[PDB]
Design a protein around this ligand. Sequence first.
Ligand SMILES: Nc1ncnc2c1ncn2[C@@H]1O[C@H](CSCC[C@H](N)C(=O)O)[C@@H](O)[C@H]1O
Ligand SMILES: Nc1ncnc2c1ncn2[C@@H]1O[C@H](CSCC[C@H](N)C(=O)O)[C@@H](O)[C@H]1O
Ligand SMILES: COc1cc2c(cc1O)[C@@H]1Cc3ccc(OC)c(O)c3CN1CC2
Ligand SMILES: COc1cc2c(cc1O)[C@@H]1Cc3ccc(OC)c(O)c3CN1CC2
Lengths: 342, 348
Amino acid sequence: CYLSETANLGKLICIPMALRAAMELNVFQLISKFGTDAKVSASEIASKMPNAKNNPEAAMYLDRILRLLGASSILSVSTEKLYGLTNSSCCLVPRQEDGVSLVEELLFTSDKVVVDSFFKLKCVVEEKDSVPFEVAHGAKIFEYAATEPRMNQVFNDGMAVFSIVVFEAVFRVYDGFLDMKELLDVGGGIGTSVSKIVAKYPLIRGVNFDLPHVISVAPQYPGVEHVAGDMFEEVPKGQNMLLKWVLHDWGDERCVKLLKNCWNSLPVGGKVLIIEFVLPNELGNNAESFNALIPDLLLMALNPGGKERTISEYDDLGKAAGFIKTIPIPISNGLHVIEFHK
Amino acid sequence: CYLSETANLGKLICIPMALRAAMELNVFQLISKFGTDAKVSASEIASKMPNAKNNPEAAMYLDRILRLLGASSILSVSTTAASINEKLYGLTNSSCCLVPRQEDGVSLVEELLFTSDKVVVDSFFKLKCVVEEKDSVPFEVAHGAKIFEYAATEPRMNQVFNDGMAVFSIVVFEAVFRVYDGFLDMKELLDVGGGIGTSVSKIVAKYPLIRGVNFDLPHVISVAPQYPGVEHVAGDMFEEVPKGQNMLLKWVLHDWGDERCVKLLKNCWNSLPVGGKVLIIEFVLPNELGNNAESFNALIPDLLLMALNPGGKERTISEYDDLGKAAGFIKTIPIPISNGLHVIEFHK
Ligand SMILES: Nc1ncnc2c1ncn2[C@@H]1O[C@H](CSCC[C@H](N)C(=O)O)[C@@H](O)[C@H]1O
Ligand SMILES: Nc1ncnc2c1ncn2[C@@H]1O[C@H](CSCC[C@H](N)C(=O)O)[C@@H](O)[C@H]1O
Ligand SMILES: COc1cc2c(cc1O)[C@@H]1Cc3ccc(OC)c(O)c3CN1CC2
Ligand SMILES: COc1cc2c(cc1O)[C@@H]1Cc3ccc(OC)c(O)c3CN1CC2
């Protein structure tokens, strides 16, 4: 049965690298500009690639990429074959309104800096206190970002664009921003998250807090103030705080130190909102499971102590930091807002 | 449904790199050694890894790799009454193919470590270049040399590639020998681009009257094992092929474009006697692609060779016939073996 399983196992590396090429060639957007329901040939797609205009062989090469994605349910195939979008590939078309899609976050998670870290993944099992990213690059990820402007941009934009589709889901379910007057986004990246909160809740004075190397490249957003610092040393005073995709980067002791910094900088009656994909109690072949397992594997490779957590585990961190009423609010497919009250 | 599709699309880079780590940690063999239908925890598996013995956290990290492979159906996941009143992992049909056999250590491990090796993945990072730039080859963009020239300067990649081909060759020839009877009457077989000689060593073991000759590049021949009944020959198949009564081309035509394939096949024709044949062994591109092993068995190397070598591609039966016909061969005989693998005989 070797030669049945050669297909099942040997496709695993090929599919993501074919997807990355298709994203870099803007294939999904090019299909969409014929119409979202269009079914178009490799040569019709290539005709919209100015870089391919002197390459007679472009379409045949492109067809070889696309037919693999068609066999892998990323594109529809119909009888030169014609390719169309699927539910998955519609999420790779920059929206006509604002350019948002999953492309930036998927370009980050399959970036060479990440894949080179995954090549050292076995180190975390064999060697005490080793970090695959460190073994691969000779510095930790946030130190690396400070010296590597390309990686800094890919990572920051991955987080920022992904943040937009996350907050659209949050705002459909969660109303806890109403009546806030000030929000501090702790480890807020380039400030996109707090920009979207202020757009929905125009009375909030938004403050975005991150490392110098991130704040110095952040765009100016209406109703957002940027502040640079180090959240483990101290956090600015704020009436309310957000920690999105921060606690999952760090081990328990670092999380408790950060959360105690937050507690000291909140007023009586203030809250910190944790937004994370929560690890469910039973894992299976479903979105809730993979939405947690994907960043669980990435953080195991990328940063010391990083991991995904259950509701009980987030509650234990907040209680160790002095917070007293944990309120977990499911949003979508494992994404939660977890309120910690001071 | 962005937050459904995050799971479907985001898992695609994660699964292969988790699998690679589990193969490097010999997880599948370790589970196999607990016996038939074994179901073992991460801590039990880690207990069998001497490198992990001073790492209290090793089992918890290993569990994070194994649970993703369980969610992906590469491992089976279960528990016990005792533990309800850490999950346990067992092998599946796919992961059984990642356990080195007791008798000779054969599995799909070596070929899967090659196709996910950094030299391959780095070539895949430049895949877009084939579409954009006339005559660009992703491997050459990534490494500043073509793959066979690179292998002569990089002994680690040479070993990973040569062992990936050789161990896969054993698996493939076991399938060939169950179906194909055309070696039976042969007295001599020259393996053109035969790698380190493993293929022709297995043909001679099965058919001891066959005098076996392995032919490949100098940097492959220099590391090839001494095999019973196999003479090694170094050279360049595009310049001159040794005389042989019969020839094999396995996983060679698919590395090259049409003009290079015709040149090589004309060199084979000239070195064959009247009544000689060349056997082509390839995963043949089906006339109609689907969602089946035969289709993926051709699409996998099709994508690999697009990244790794100029002109390399998988071909249909008609396209192979056309190459043989252009080189002077007659009577193409396509013989299906298994899941798209064929022997195609070209007769002089
Ligand atoms: N010591 C520190 N102080 C402040 N920010 C830090 C930090 N260490 C890491 N960070 C920031 O933590 C962030 C984690 S990634 C998540 C960013 C953003 N909250 C989002 O959800 O999109 C990065 O922007 C990183 O630069
Ligand atoms: N010019 C040339 N002359 C001889 N061998 C060549 C060559 N160019 C490439 N090769 C060889 O072609 C082989 C392709 S890989 C397949 C190897 C083997 N036939 C198998 O099926 O396992 C490699 O071993 C490679 O070194
Ligand atoms: C479901 O799919 C995904 C989910 C998530 C991420 C990427 C995915 O593809 C990213 C990956 C990632 C990597 C590094 C980080 O800091 C070093 C980080 O905060 C995040 C955030 N998470 C959020 C959750
Ligand atoms: C179905 O899965 C697979 C099928 C095949 C290969 C690898 C797979 O995983 C390898 C990949 C490969 C890469 C480069 C080569 O020369 C440069 C080459 O001859 C081969 C051989 N083919 C045989 C078919």
